[PDB]
Write a protein that holds these residues in place. Sequence first.
Motif, PDB file in Angstrom:
ATOM      1  N   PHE A   1      24.023 -21.522   3.421  1.00  0.00           N
ATOM      2  CA  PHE A   1      22.926 -20.943   4.013  1.00  0.00           C
ATOM      3  C   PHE A   1      22.737 -21.299   5.563  1.00  0.00           C
ATOM      4  O   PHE A   1      22.623 -20.538   6.534  1.00  0.00           O
ATOM      5  CB  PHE A   1      21.770 -20.859   3.159  1.00  0.00           C
ATOM      6  N   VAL A   2      22.364 -22.640   5.665  1.00  0.00           N
ATOM      7  CA  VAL A   2      22.126 -23.215   6.964  1.00  0.00           C
ATOM      8  C   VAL A   2      23.387 -22.670   7.920  1.00  0.00           C
ATOM      9  O   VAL A   2      22.950 -22.295   9.168  1.00  0.00           O
ATOM     10  CB  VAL A   2      21.951 -24.643   7.062  1.00  0.00           C
ATOM     11  N   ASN A   3      24.367 -22.841   7.617  1.00  0.00           N
ATOM     12  CA  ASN A   3      25.708 -22.539   8.398  1.00  0.00           C
ATOM     13  C   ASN A   3      25.514 -20.888   8.762  1.00  0.00           C
ATOM     14  O   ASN A   3      25.715 -20.692   9.786  1.00  0.00           O
ATOM     15  CB  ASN A   3      26.942 -22.909   7.810  1.00  0.00           C
ATOM     16  N   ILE A   4      25.158 -20.120   7.677  1.00  0.00           N
ATOM     17  CA  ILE A   4      25.282 -18.671   8.149  1.00  0.00           C
ATOM     18  C   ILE A   4      23.885 -18.434   9.036  1.00  0.00           C
ATOM     19  O   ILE A   4      24.114 -17.587  10.013  1.00  0.00           O
ATOM     20  CB  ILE A   4      25.015 -17.961   6.835  1.00  0.00           C
ATOM     21  N   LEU A   5      23.010 -19.131   8.948  1.00  0.00           N
ATOM     22  CA  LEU A   5      21.524 -19.228  10.084  1.00  0.00           C
ATOM     23  C   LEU A   5      22.262 -19.727  11.291  1.00  0.00           C
ATOM     24  O   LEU A   5      21.543 -19.361  12.222  1.00  0.00           O
ATOM     25  CB  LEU A   5      20.516 -19.497   9.325  1.00  0.00           C
ATOM     26  N   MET A   6      23.071 -20.870  11.207  1.00  0.00           N
ATOM     27  CA  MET A   6      23.482 -21.549  12.245  1.00  0.00           C
ATOM     28  C   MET A   6      23.807 -20.541  13.337  1.00  0.00           C
ATOM     29  O   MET A   6      24.720 -19.506  13.154  1.00  0.00           O
ATOM     30  CB  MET A   6      24.253 -22.586  11.955  1.00  0.00           C
ATOM     31  N   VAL A   7      23.594 -21.296  14.853  1.00  0.00           N
ATOM     32  CA  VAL A   7      23.930 -20.256  15.931  1.00  0.00           C
ATOM     33  C   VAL A   7      24.496 -21.425  17.100  1.00  0.00           C
ATOM     34  O   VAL A   7      23.821 -22.224  17.066  1.00  0.00           O
ATOM     35  CB  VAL A   7      23.244 -19.416  16.732  1.00  0.00           C
ATOM     36  N   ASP A   8      25.491 -21.146  17.588  1.00  0.00           N
ATOM     37  CA  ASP A   8      25.819 -22.171  18.797  1.00  0.00           C
ATOM     38  C   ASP A   8      26.092 -23.727  18.282  1.00  0.00           C
ATOM     39  O   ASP A   8      25.661 -24.279  18.952  1.00  0.00           O
ATOM     40  CB  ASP A   8      25.025 -22.056  19.971  1.00  0.00           C
ATOM     41  N   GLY A   9      26.441 -23.872  16.884  1.00  0.00           N
ATOM     42  CA  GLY A   9      26.768 -25.069  16.569  1.00  0.00           C
ATOM     43  C   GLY A   9      25.344 -25.839  16.583  1.00  0.00           C
ATOM     44  O   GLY A   9      25.573 -27.206  16.520  1.00  0.00           O
ATOM     45  N   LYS A  10      24.441 -25.130  16.521  1.00  0.00           N
ATOM     46  CA  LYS A  10      22.951 -26.015  16.599  1.00  0.00           C
ATOM     47  C   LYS A  10      22.654 -26.323  15.218  1.00  0.00           C
ATOM     48  O   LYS A  10      21.572 -25.948  14.499  1.00  0.00           O
ATOM     49  CB  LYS A  10      21.834 -24.974  17.055  1.00  0.00           C
ATOM     50  N   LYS A  11      23.256 -27.277  14.506  1.00  0.00           N
ATOM     51  CA  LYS A  11      23.129 -27.490  12.807  1.00  0.00           C
ATOM     52  C   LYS A  11      21.613 -28.168  12.731  1.00  0.00           C
ATOM     53  O   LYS A  11      20.992 -27.827  11.998  1.00  0.00           O
ATOM     54  CB  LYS A  11      24.194 -28.392  12.527  1.00  0.00           C
ATOM     55  N   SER A  12      21.387 -29.033  13.534  1.00  0.00           N
ATOM     56  CA  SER A  12      19.973 -29.965  13.692  1.00  0.00           C
ATOM     57  C   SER A  12      18.809 -28.863  13.683  1.00  0.00           C
ATOM     58  O   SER A  12      17.808 -29.185  12.926  1.00  0.00           O
ATOM     59  CB  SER A  12      19.913 -30.635  14.982  1.00  0.00           C
ATOM     60  N   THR A  13      18.896 -27.726  14.548  1.00  0.00           N
ATOM     61  CA  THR A  13      18.013 -26.986  14.696  1.00  0.00           C
ATOM     62  C   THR A  13      18.088 -25.716  13.855  1.00  0.00           C
ATOM     63  O   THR A  13      16.926 -25.044  13.543  1.00  0.00           O
ATOM     64  CB  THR A  13      17.979 -26.231  16.176  1.00  0.00           C
ATOM     65  N   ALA A  14      19.142 -25.443  13.083  1.00  0.00           N
ATOM     66  CA  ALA A  14      19.526 -24.510  11.868  1.00  0.00           C
ATOM     67  C   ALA A  14      18.773 -24.863  10.603  1.00  0.00           C
ATOM     68  O   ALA A  14      17.821 -24.121  10.151  1.00  0.00           O
ATOM     69  CB  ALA A  14      20.764 -24.446  11.791  1.00  0.00           C
ATOM     70  N   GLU A  15      18.769 -26.178  10.190  1.00  0.00           N
ATOM     71  CA  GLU A  15      18.389 -26.538   8.987  1.00  0.00           C
ATOM     72  C   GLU A  15      16.972 -26.612   8.986  1.00  0.00           C
ATOM     73  O   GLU A  15      16.263 -26.531   8.005  1.00  0.00           O
ATOM     74  CB  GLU A  15      19.128 -27.788   8.570  1.00  0.00           C
ATOM     75  N   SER A  16      16.503 -27.116  10.239  1.00  0.00           N
ATOM     76  CA  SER A  16      14.811 -27.068  10.548  1.00  0.00           C
ATOM     77  C   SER A  16      14.337 -26.007  10.228  1.00  0.00           C
ATOM     78  O   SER A  16      13.179 -25.638   9.680  1.00  0.00           O
ATOM     79  CB  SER A  16      14.715 -27.473  11.968  1.00  0.00           C
ATOM     80  N   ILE A  17      14.954 -24.737  10.804  1.00  0.00           N
ATOM     81  CA  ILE A  17      14.343 -23.333  10.566  1.00  0.00           C
ATOM     82  C   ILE A  17      14.554 -22.967   9.171  1.00  0.00           C
ATOM     83  O   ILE A  17      13.571 -22.311   8.643  1.00  0.00           O
ATOM     84  CB  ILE A  17      14.896 -22.366  11.190  1.00  0.00           C
ATOM     85  N   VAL A  18      15.495 -23.329   8.292  1.00  0.00           N
ATOM     86  CA  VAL A  18      15.755 -23.008   6.998  1.00  0.00           C
ATOM     87  C   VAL A  18      14.786 -23.841   6.046  1.00  0.00           C
ATOM     88  O   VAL A  18      14.055 -23.063   5.111  1.00  0.00           O
ATOM     89  CB  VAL A  18      17.114 -23.279   6.477  1.00  0.00           C
ATOM     90  N   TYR A  19      14.478 -24.971   6.226  1.00  0.00           N
ATOM     91  CA  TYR A  19      13.453 -25.705   5.625  1.00  0.00           C
ATOM     92  C   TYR A  19      11.881 -25.288   5.666  1.00  0.00           C
ATOM     93  O   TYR A  19      11.453 -24.999   4.896  1.00  0.00           O
ATOM     94  CB  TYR A  19      13.702 -27.071   5.739  1.00  0.00           C
TER      95      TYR A  19
END
Lengths: 56, 117, 76, 151, 91
Positions: free
Chosen positions: D25-43
Motif C-alpha cells: 500500500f505505501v509503495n502504491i501511494l509512494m511517489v518519486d521514491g519518497k518512501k519516508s514521506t509515503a508511509e507518513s501519509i499512510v499512517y
Amino acid sequence: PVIKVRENEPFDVALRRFKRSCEKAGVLAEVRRREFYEKPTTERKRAKASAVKRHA
Amino acid sequence: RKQVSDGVAHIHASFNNTIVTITDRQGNALGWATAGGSGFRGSRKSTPFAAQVAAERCADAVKEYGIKNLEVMVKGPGPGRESTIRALNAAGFRITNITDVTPIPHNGCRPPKKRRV
Amino acid sequence: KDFIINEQIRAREVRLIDQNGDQLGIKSKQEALEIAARRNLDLVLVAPNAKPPVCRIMDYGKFRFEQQKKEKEARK
Amino acid sequence: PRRRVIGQRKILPDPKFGSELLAKFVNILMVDGKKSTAESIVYSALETLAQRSGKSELEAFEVALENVRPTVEVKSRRVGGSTYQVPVEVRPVRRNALAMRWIVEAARKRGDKSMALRLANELSDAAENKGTAVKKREDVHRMAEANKAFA
Amino acid sequence: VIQVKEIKFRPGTDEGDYQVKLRSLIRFLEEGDKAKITLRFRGREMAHQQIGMEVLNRVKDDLQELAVVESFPTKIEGRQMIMVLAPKKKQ
RNA sequence: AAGGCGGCCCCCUGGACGAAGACUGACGCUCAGGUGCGAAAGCGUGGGGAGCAAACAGGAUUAGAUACCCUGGUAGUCCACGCCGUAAACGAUGUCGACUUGGAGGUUGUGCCCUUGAGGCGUGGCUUCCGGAGCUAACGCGUUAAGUCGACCGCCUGGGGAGUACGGCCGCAAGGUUAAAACUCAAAUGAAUUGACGGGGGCCCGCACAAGCGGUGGAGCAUGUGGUUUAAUUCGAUGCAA
RNA sequence: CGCGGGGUGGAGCAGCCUGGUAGCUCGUCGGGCUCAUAACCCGAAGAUCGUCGGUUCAAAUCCGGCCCCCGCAACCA
C-alpha cells in the motif's frame, strides 16, 4: 436427440446432456453441410483429402 | 383469460434470427416473440443475447394462461438455440423435455449455390 | 403512408372511428384498444396531429398491402 | 513475458505493523521514491481512520478493502477483425492490488486538504462501500456481467 | 425532388465503353435526377482540348433527346471538369 | 471398356472370380480402314416442372460494376423418342504376354485346424499406402513399373500463326472430323535450386502488444529544423536511421 | 385561337386517380477514412409542392384559370 429431465436433476445438467446429444448426433455439422450445394466432384475431392489426412 | 399449465416452447433458430413461440400440446399458439422485433437489428439481431430477451418477452405474453411446465423444441443452427432455453428456465419455468427437431432431408431438394464472397 | 398502431400509440385519449365509418367519439386509448381487439382489427393512428388524435379501426396489414399493390401496379 | 515466466519480488513488511499488505500500500501511494514521506501519509490516514472510527487499524483497513475488491473483470481481445471483451475471473493477489490502487487514486482525485485526510476519507467511504473507489469496482462488474455471454 | 447523381467519362472512354454508359447516364437522368458528368482528365487545369469536349459534348449531343446540360462548362477545376447535366427543362 | 453407376422390391440381362475335374486342340495377340459406345451443355417434337438456375428484371457494392452479394426468375436441369460425338473424356501413363527383393493394410473367393474364442496355417482375384534394385532431367515410378524383354497399333519433330484456312465427309443448328501454308520470333517449354513476395500460411523472439509507473501532444521559456524575411540571415544533416 | 408532357429545395425527382408536418439523388457546407488526395462513409443546411380562385376536417396530391418550360407539333421554301 430427444431428452427427458429426471427428478431433482438441475436444468443445467439436463441441458449439458442435450447439447452433448446433439454433439453426438451431428445436427449443426449436418445443417452446415447442406446450407449450400456441393458439386459431386467437390465431395469426392473432400473424401480423398480426408482419407489422406487420416494417415499419421 | 384461460388456463393451460402445460406447454411447449418451439424455438426457431436460424442464422439471421431466432423466433420463439409458446404453445399448448395441441400445437395451438399461445404467445410469441422474436429477436428481430425486440429492438435488435442486423449484426445484433443475430446474437444469443437477442434470443434471450426474445425468450423473456415471450414469457410475459403467455403467463396470462399461467403455464407452469413445458417442453422445448429446438429447430435450426443459429445462436439462441441454447441461450433462449436458458432465459425460459430463469423466467420461472420447469423444463420437462428438450428435443432437437431440426429438419434433415434424406437428400431431396438441391440447395442454393455456394456464396462466393 | 406508415402509421403507428396499437401499443405504439402514446395518446391518452383519441377520437375513434370504426371500420365502417361510425364515429365512436372520444375514448381512452385503453378502451379504443379493447374495441379493436374484440373486432380482431388494429387501432391505427390516422391523424396524429388532430385534436384529439384520430384513430381508425381497420386491418393494418390488408390496408398496407393494398396501398403498396396500388403503387406498384400503376408504375409497371 | 513471451517466454520468460517469473516469480515476484516479495517486499519487506510494513515497518510499523509488520504487514506485507501495507507495504504494498505505501509503495502504491509512494511517489518519486519518497518512501519516508509515503508511509507518513499512510499512517496518519490510518491514525485518523483508527482513532475516530472504532479502532482496529488492520481490520479497519480490511473492511474498506473488502469493499473495493473486485471478483471479476474484462480482458480486451482481438479475434476475427473484432475487438471482443472477454470477462476473466481475477486472482486473489491482484484483487488486493486493484483494491488498494483504486483507493489511492480516488484519494488524490479528492477535494480535501491533504493526502492523509483524503486517504482517510477514502478508506472511510470505502469502508461504508461508497465513493469513487467502490464505484470503480461496480463499473468493472457492470462491464463484466454485460459480456457474460463470452466467458 | 431532383437528386444529384453522377457519371464519369475518363479519357479512353470512347464509343465502345462510352455510349454503353451514356445508356447508364440516360438511366440517371430518366429516374428524374440531375445527372452530373465529371470528367477526370489525365491532365491538368487545362488538360485537354480533346479529352473533355469530345466526350462531354457528344454526351450532350447524343442524350439531347432526353437530357440537356446546364452548361458546357469548359472551365476545369483541378485535373477534372464537371459538366453538369440535368433533365431537359420544360419551358 | 471408357463415359460413368448409390433408398427398397421384383422381372429381363452382361461381365468378373473361386473350387474340382472333363471336353475342344494354338481355335491366339494386335489392328490402319469400318462399326458401336460415349459426362455436361446444346438441338427437334410432345409431356413434366417442387428445388436449383444461364438469360433477363429489380435492390446493393464501387471511381465505374454489363460482376462478385441480395430479392425475383425463363431456358435448362426431369420423362419418352430422335440428334449432337465433345471435356483437365486424366493414371495427362495404348493393348497383350513373360520375367525381376520386401513391409503394412482394405476388399472378395477357397483348402486345412481340439470350428471348442470374435482365431491358428495355407491358396487365388482386385485394391490402398510405403519402399529395394533398376529406371528417371529431376519430381518421382518401383511385381497394378515409369524396372528387364517381346508382338502389334496410335502419335511427336522449336514457339506463335492453328487444331486456323481451303477442300472432303458428317450435323436441323451449334458445330465436329480430317488438316495445311505465308508471315514472325530465338526462343517457347519441363523439373529442381537460392532469394524475394503472398490480402498467404505455420512456429518463434524483442518494453512489440498485454500488465504497470511516469511522461510528450496544452502553457511559458531553452533549443534544432522548416517556412517566411533579409544585404547576409554561411555550408551540411531530412521516414524508422535529419 | 393548335397538339404532348411537366412546374417541390441550388439542379433534376419521388411522394399520383391510393387528400393529413415534402423525402429521395447529384451539388452546397461540415465531419469521418488516408502520410496526403482522389474515391468512399457519417451528417446537417436547403421549400407559399408555379401562381389564384374553388373546395374541405386537413387538399402535395383535389378542379379550373393566369403563367412558364420542354415535347413534337412550326418558320413546313
